Amino acid sequence: IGWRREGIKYRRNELFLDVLESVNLLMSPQGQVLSAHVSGRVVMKSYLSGMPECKFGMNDKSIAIDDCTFHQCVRLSRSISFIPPDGEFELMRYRTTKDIILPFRVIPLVREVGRTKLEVKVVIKSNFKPSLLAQKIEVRIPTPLNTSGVQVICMKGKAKYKASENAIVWKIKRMAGMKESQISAEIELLPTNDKKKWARPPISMNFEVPFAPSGLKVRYLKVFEPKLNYSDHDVIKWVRYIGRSGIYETRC
């Protein structure tokens, strides 16, 4: 075993699991999902006495994994089984497409006003238990190149027009499950080349949520060391989930 030495000792035997997932979406203006997927990895941080035999179990047949590689130390077939390296390492990588929780729904509305103004209202809805908070929320709304100026009103958060980047950027520190928020913007237009139709790019979002969008959920982590005089019940165990946007585009 060339990834872990033999005489390791700790007064306090503790591990930490991180389930880290990126969730990706492309949605039509109607509300059809054109494309969606999750990339995820499990990271372990282990301060454990000896050379222990850990067994890792999740709800894996309960949601549906499309494929996944593992670390050297994993012995194949099922629940997963290994003697971990000490400290921090990558236990597995994985992908999932069926049955994804999409944390946010984006509902755009756009109206033209002669050749002089655009009217835009965007509504975000959060879709998860109310006991949980999303944080670090950005909503990016693109503006035409003939844009002369922009007014916004928003009851929650803060929004500036960023002329360099040709976009309105709306930021929110935190927001809870099953809620609704809206922004309005009036976009003042310069006159333009007449047969230039605007190709309306997507509205895109960023966020972080404390659950796995894939549905995945940790069911046991069991530690057994036969030589030494601590059992499973002696180990102090912790889990966290961090689900973050990848590409999350909603077409207007």
């Binding site: 982590l221 912790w238 889990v239």
Partner: peptide
Amino acid sequence: SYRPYA
């Protein structure tokens, strides 16, 4: 932010 699992 780390939930007891023990």
